[PDB]
Amino acid sequence: GENKRKAKVKQIITAESRFVEVEGDKIEGLEEGETPNVWGFIPIIHFKNEADETLKYGQSDIEPIEPLLKAYHDVMLHALKGS
Amino acid sequence: EKLRLLLNDKDKKSFTDEELNLFLEEADCIYCAASQGWILKSLQYENTVGEMYEYKVGQETYKSSSIKDLVSVAYQNADKFKDMCTNKKEKGSFMLGISTEFE
């Protein structure tokens, strides 16, 4: 209809079961509380770009170039202002 | 007192204080008013001293300073006060930042 609905849902997924709780308006699709996992593995897969033995997460291909992008932006902007 | 300092800058007992107030009002800087008053006082030498710069009567002989020298000295004093006014109000060179907005 017209109503505005806010909902801060957070959920803990594990191999044994899934837990979901919502703080706000009711969402019809989600059943709060623990729900069992039909299989004993976590259904999420992590794609780790440029994975490293010393890093928990991946790392973007923009990170190595980013300071060069900053310097390029600074040089171009200063050139444009001077022109 | 501004008037007393101006009378010191431009000698007393010649002008009445009304024109002194006028000179003070026409320029806040006292030395500018002093230069103006010195020029206007230089104008008065044609009456106070006159052209007759030297004369001898009987055994008396008097040689006063010529009017040209007196007006020249008054002009020099006025110029000194004007330069003082400039230097007091003068400010050195400056290098400043410049910037134009851009997207």
Side-chain angles (χ1 to χ4, degrees), chain A residues 1-37 39-59 61-83, chain B:
Chain A
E2 176 268 336
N3 305 274
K4 304 297 292 299
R5 314 296 197 73
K6 275 69 66 177
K8 181 175 178 181
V9 69
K10 64 189 290 297
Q11 54 194 332
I12 315 310
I13 316 309
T14 75
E16 295 83 3
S17 63
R18 148 168 193 194
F19 179 79
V20 65
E21 68 89 9
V22 72
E23 190 277 325
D25 299 300
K26 172 56 180 185
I27 288 156
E28 53 265 26
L30 308 180
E31 302 188 348
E32 278 201 68
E34 177 267 325
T35 185
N37 203 342
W39 294 273
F41 54 82
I42 294 145
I44 300 98
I45 301 88
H46 190 176
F47 282 92
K48 208 178 290 201
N49 178 22
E50 287 268 289
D52 191 292
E53 64 193 2
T54 78
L55 265 287
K56 186 172 183 290
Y57 303 100
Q59 64 197 356
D61 308 66
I62 304 101
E63 279 160 280
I65 58 169
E66 184 270 356
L68 306 180
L69 305 180
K70 182 62 176 48
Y72 197 89
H73 175 94
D74 271 25
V75 167
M76 186 91 82
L77 175 55
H78 195 264
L80 261 55
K81 286 182 179 194
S83 165
Chain B
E1 173 45 55
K2 49 176 157 50
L3 188 143
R4 181 59 57 75
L5 177 55
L6 186 55
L7 283 175
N8 186 53
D9 289 350
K10 181 266 289 180
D11 300 60
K12 201 162 63 171
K13 309 180 183 177
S14 176
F15 288 10
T16 182
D17 293 352
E18 198 279 330
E19 49 262 24
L20 275 291
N21 298 267
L22 189 148
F23 304 144
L24 289 154
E25 293 295 323
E26 288 300 318
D28 58 353
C29 189
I30 192 161
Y31 302 135
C32 203
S35 171
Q36 185 76 338
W38 256 106
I39 291 162
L40 293 168
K41 182 167 151 70
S42 78
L43 306 187
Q44 313 313 323
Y45 292 138
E46 285 178 349
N47 294 353
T48 62
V49 171
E51 321 97 317
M52 195 150 286
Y53 73 96
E54 184 175 31
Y55 69 97
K56 170 180 173 183
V57 299
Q59 319 204 41
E60 306 266 33
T61 300
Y62 299 109
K63 200 185 191 185
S64 71
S65 306
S66 82
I67 189 168
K68 199 178 180 186
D69 299 318
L70 289 172
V71 66
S72 178
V73 169
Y75 276 36
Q76 206 182 351
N77 296 331
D79 174 77
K80 273 284 180 187
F81 285 122
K82 178 50 56 169
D83 296 17
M84 206 158 283
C85 175
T86 56
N87 302 337
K88 187 64 63 166
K89 299 269 148 179
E90 186 267 332
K91 315 292 147 61
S93 299
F94 283 90
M95 155 164 79
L96 314 173
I98 182 161
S99 64
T100 186
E101 69 279 14
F102 198 85
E103 198 274 356

